[PDB]
């Protein structure tokens, strides 16, 4: 796998995820907790994202070659799970607050924030 | 000169990449507290700016992924895009400063790099 790329497609959908639910959240007039809560997933967001700039780099640093050790393979794979929990609480704090009523789950919205990253 | 979100996001992505990417090889090459605190004046340059701009997310959205924007909205975009490419020219130079790159032909590498990890 392209290691950088994977985690970084991956927090650039959860900060643009974000960004999405804190605009609904302005146009719609959201509850004190709730803006809590979309705080609480942005610095969680934070905290992985930093975890794994020393890839960004180390990718590009080796001839961009995909040839990481075991360790670094490990710490990568376990961030790039938190993420996949982040994603989750996102998807589920979208449906919380009244985005995709009259939707089939969250799928245009997901669509629509694929398109912004690609 | 640009199509609303997608255009916004890409800029914003390759910022915080480029941010990632110094702040990575500040790690395994060592750096003061005054090396890393410029670094941290870009980053905070850049979610200025994102936090301005972030209404445009949901907003396309709610008018069928059209980049349809008002006065306001298309001025406060403009100042927002301007903004953007002078944070870009300042990681350059950072990229330069630090000594990840000597010359032009290095920041393209890089600028190709980071690219290639947004795209």
Redesign the interface.
């Known amino acids: 796998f392209n290691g ?2 994977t985690v ?1 497609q991956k ?2 959908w959860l ?2 995820a974000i ?6 959240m ?2 719609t007039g959201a509850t004190k907790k709730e803006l809590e809560q979309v705080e609480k997933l942005k610095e969680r967001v934070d905290e992985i ?2 975890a ?7 990718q ?2 080796r001839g ?1 070659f995909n040839l990481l050790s075991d360790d670094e393979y490990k710490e990568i794979q376990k961030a790039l799970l938190v993420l996949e929990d982040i994603k989750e609480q996102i998807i589920v704090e979208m449906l919380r607050v009244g985005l995709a009523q009259g939707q089939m789950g969250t799928l245009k ?1 997901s669509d ?1 924030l694929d ?4």
């Open positions: 950088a790329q970084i927090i650039s900060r643009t960004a999405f639910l804190k605009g609904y302005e146009t994202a930093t794994v700039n020393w890839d960004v780099y180390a590009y640093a961009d919205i629509y398109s912004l990253d690609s």
